[PDB]
Symmetry: D2
Subunit: 384 residues, 4 copies
């Protein structure tokens, strides 16, 4: 279980470098240097990093302070063989975003929110990122009257339209991925589930430009099955990226290491990507708990990497045992892949074995046999 760069594991600068400041208390570690965060991840076995625009360059820095920061960061990229596959904008930390960016009430703020996104699109294309993740963390409200949603759904689309026009005119070969979250920091946020995000995308002037970035924890916060959100996304060709962490149920976004929270969910999820052929970057968006020092930090992401490598093993072993392969056929998982009525509407309607001569009592007695399967994946997951 030593991760290789060919696993394409990415981490974020913000995730290992989180200083442990929480809504109630102060930061228990000092600020890292992005140079030192790059070298270190290449000595654990990771494959790339990802950053918001305030990560790499501090807010308000002068254009010569900007490039020096970019030159250092680049030199590190050239000193580790590590890439930057995804990049993103910080639209949430400055008090001028307190009511959002793209959906902020005030008109003058929305324009600035757009200009600060485009300026980081040019940086991420230069550092070669193939994905561009957008999380409206401040879009939504705390009170039913504060945000008229239909207008707020009108200004979102606008800005994401403009983002699609900026990239077409420039010749940039990059795609957007919206990241949803139902609440926190806002009491409600717009486009809450992965499903809501798919709905909004189909209404943009160029639907082939935008996917979704889902997160394990963000969907489990609404009590929602994640490997089930991850199938709908693959089913409409819209899994562009995915965020790997752990979460213990409906509550504040804990952002635990991947492996924690719900382990059977992390199992069935790794099963689904490997067997459906997801070739994107396994990104960990998480938070090493604030109790730990720096030694607890680097042990934490080694976990992320090491837990995925174990389930992928138990996932493949589950799918290679000919006792499971029979167990699948006894629940009739194969008929679920065959068409219901390939013979056509008229044949169906003419078929008397489907209604008038159908034995509803002999069908209803057939046992689905789901509980001996679920234990064979229980056996395969615990290795007993």
């Amino acid at each position: 279980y030593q991760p290789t760069p060919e696993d394409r594991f990415t981490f974020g600068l913000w995730t290992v470098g989180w200083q442990g400041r929480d809504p109630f208390g102060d930061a228990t570690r000092r600020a890292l240097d992005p140079v030192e965060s790059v070298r270190r991840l290449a000595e654990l076995g990771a494959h790339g990093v990802t950053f918001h625009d305030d990560d790499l360059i501090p807010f308000g820095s002068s254009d010569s302070e900007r490039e020096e920061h970019v030159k250092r960061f680049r030199q590190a990229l050239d000193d580790t063989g590590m890439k930057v596959p995804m990049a993103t904008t910080n639209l949430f930390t400055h008090p001028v975003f307190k009511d959002g960016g793209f959906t902020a009430n005030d008109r003058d703020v929305r324009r600035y929110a757009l200009r600060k996104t485009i300026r980081n699109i040019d940086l991420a294309v230069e550092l070669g990122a193939e994905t561009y993740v957008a999380w409206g963390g401040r879009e939504g409200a705390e009170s039913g009257g504060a945000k008229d949603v239909r207008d707020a759904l009108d200004r979102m689309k606008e800005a994401f339209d403009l983002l699609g026009e900026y990239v077409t005119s420039q010749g940039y070969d990059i795609r957007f991925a919206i990241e949803p979250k139902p609440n926190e920091p806002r009491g409600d946020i717009l486009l809450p589930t992965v499903g809501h995000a798919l709905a909004f995308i189909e209404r943009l002037e160029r639907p082939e430009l935008y996917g979704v970035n889902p997160e394990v924890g963000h969907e489990q916060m609404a009590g929602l099955n994640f490997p089930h959100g991850i199938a709908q996304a693959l089913w409409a060709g819209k899994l562009f990226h995915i965020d790997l962490n752990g979460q213990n149920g409906i509550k504040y976004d804990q952002d635990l290491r991947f492996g924690a929270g719900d382990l059977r969910a992390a199992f069935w999820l790794v099963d689904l990507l490997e067997s459906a052929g997801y070739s994107g970057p396994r990104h960990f968006d998480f938070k090493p708990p604030r109790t730990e020092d720096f030694d607890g930090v680097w042990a934490s992401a080694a976990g992320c990497m090491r837990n995925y490598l174990i389930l992928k093993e138990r996932a493949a072993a589950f799918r290679a045992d000919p006792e499971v392969q029979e167990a699948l056929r006894a629940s009739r998982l194969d008929e679920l892949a065959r068409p219901t009525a390939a013979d056509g509407l008229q044949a169906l309607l003419d078929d008397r074995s489907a209604f008038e001569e159908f034995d509803v009592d002999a069908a209803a007695a057939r046992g689905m046999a789901f509980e001996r399967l679920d234990q064979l994946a229980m056996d395969h997951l615990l290795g007993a």
Copy 2:
């Protein structure tokens, strides 16, 4: 607060006629006669009824028992002046649906599930219903391996495709409305929120044929703001129907009377339909609690009707007070309706007042003034 038939209030046969049998205990009232449920609602002030196909005719009845039941029910419709605007299929109560209908694993069941839907489409068109609500109550799973979702999203669409072909060929002038629910009876169900349902619809061969039937309680079960789900639906032209009840948070579907559960949510919701021009049937899908007798029953739906008539009054009064109308302008609710960049991408990008000469500290200090508004709707809602 006497409801008039011009309010278009509908109830369901199943809702007043619920016998009070719960997952743990037995039925505390005896079965009603659909004739007696029709006369009675016309003496409270309601405008129509709605039914599943097992409501009006018992399951398995012979075709002469079917028409006699239809003839009685019709004679009542002719003896009250009441209509049937929406109708729906019972795909959940018989044990042959234990794993669903349209998404049931077995192939022979899915065909039957389709045939039992079409046969009730012909009844509802004869009784003149304009809407046809579909609630996959048994679609979903309890275990991560039991339902491959991408296949299950393939067989849904199929059947809803076939339903759209059956209605086009026949000349029927009716539309479908999917009704979502995140769980119960199944531990998870497919297409959980109103947003998921909008996503699935755009992928059917005829997108102008299907809307959503939302329910207050079904979305509040996932901790989701309902007057916010009700705006996204209006914003894509897909509010075909709506179900009115009450619910106290994330838990088993209580199905309380409209007015209970969350009253401010019921306030902001009635505000939104009246000010956006919803002309559909105000349907109450609810359950008079099983403790009550028949006298408690008829008092219960009188509540439903009487609580909507009060909020519509407090909603209009809130929107007519020129102190509110000023209060809206002080939060800048008017600029939220104006475009962000009608002058065009190039102008925005050339405008130095939007970035380089923008005063971020003087904007961030402007107070949104949300809390004096929210009390004026507090004042308007309690009438003090």
Copy 3:
């Protein structure tokens, strides 16, 4: 609805003075002066203030800086006629409390946590507070192995034992009130509900010294009926204090103004204190949302005060209408106050009308008539 000081309304220095810094973003208002927070509340109609020990005096201040701060604050108390009925310790903001105070793993921290509590007990007795609220905000864990609970329940009791010994020896005439919260900032916290807190209290060497400080929002976070927690407390003589705010369900502690969140819950709660004779300080522990300026601030607490004064009116009107008073008797609310078996075990057991000659079908048909009552309190709450 002008609040009078005889309403005994208290606010906290920390609540109006919250600077709007959240887990994701920066503070949108500047720091208040406790002098200016005192004068202002006396011009709205409030009756007292309450403070943590880091509020009034900054952490680490020298003993001459301490008394000057106390002298200023006192002079204000003498310049408004306002009292300080409750006081409390800040055990959560400094990084030396990251794992708790009384339950912190390390031994040297626990002693310091005790010394910093006693030193503020002497201040609050000097400023005359009658209650001393204790919220272990940092007690609990994020991981099943980090905190052995039985030991952690052993060190709590210890420190609360020592607190009871310090006050008995000194002659102080003050009582403690534990404040529970199920999670946040910690993912789980110890003694989560009001019920857990009552359980822990009975095990201290002096049970007549400790009550509970409950909070509306803290119990609604676990999906729990608050006017029902507020009855169990009164029923064992342990409602020493209560915190008034609002909360929209299970999620991060919003701390909305009293009146928001759940209004029917705030109704039935004000009903319960007024009709049971609670004579304690109506304290508002809340957070004016960070979008507002200072003008939005002072409007916010005026709400708190003004919403309580409205429900107390609708609560009394509900309890004075002889149609309600009959409505209570028809549900048999009076027999619920009579004893089940005052005649004694032997009589009960000899009574053949209670078993062998009991008509179970004629009892089960009697209607509890709950839904016509609930609308009369609906009518009384909306005033229609």
Copy 4:
């Protein structure tokens, strides 16, 4: 992983014999014979059974039909070597309990509720049960006005007082265990958590007579850590029984097999009983999902038994590795067992190393090292 009768595993007649009837649909299996449920469990390796009083004898049976049923059941007990360690009363299924038993409003019902409990106490003492579990499933309300809680807390205690007097006078050597649940079937139920139940117990005239029966699923429904509820119970000497199943979060009581739902919670729980010396009956209160036939049934409880036997192995292996034993000492789990101030209040207060000469910055930098531990139990749980 073959369970032996010396594991003391009990099942309930009602759990394997659940017919699969749910709040929305009909029963997918036929009724078992309690004789056939007894023989079968003795061929899987279980140690006893448990029953409600309507299980073994149908409601209303004549006293000769009662004893014949008891004689058959007994003959089976004599034909398997299996015991009946716990028994319980069905106070929830008949419509005369729709508003509760002990807390039912009506006076005549409460007396009957008491008489039907005592009559089953005499049966369970004859069949030799050592525990007597009581679940007020119908105690609570759906509406804030329907149940005055303080009175309702007065009639509970009464009946549980009377139950304690009936057993003292008779010479019965048996103890009660209250079983809590926050909601369902009622929207709220009284004494919701394990903590609330401990609080109610200390107020009965004979506190050494009543413990708590906790259930994994019942506490996880309120989002509450179960191995943490299971420590508070052991810490006050009040773990008399425990119910083993699985549950996926806050929602309707799924009652999955032990092993499902939250596996790390089931891990840390088996860890806690084995290392604290719980000698009671490992009872499975669960529901084989209704999709299965009878073959899926018996595979299901074999799981329950087989999953506990695996964690007890991984739990012991985790606690025997001297790399863990060092890992415990590095988080300072040993100082958490030492007293904070065994030297006494006066010494603490005189100790200048605990306040005035205390290095708060060198303590706050010490890393708790929680994340390398949690992975060693991750390694020990997955066996990698």
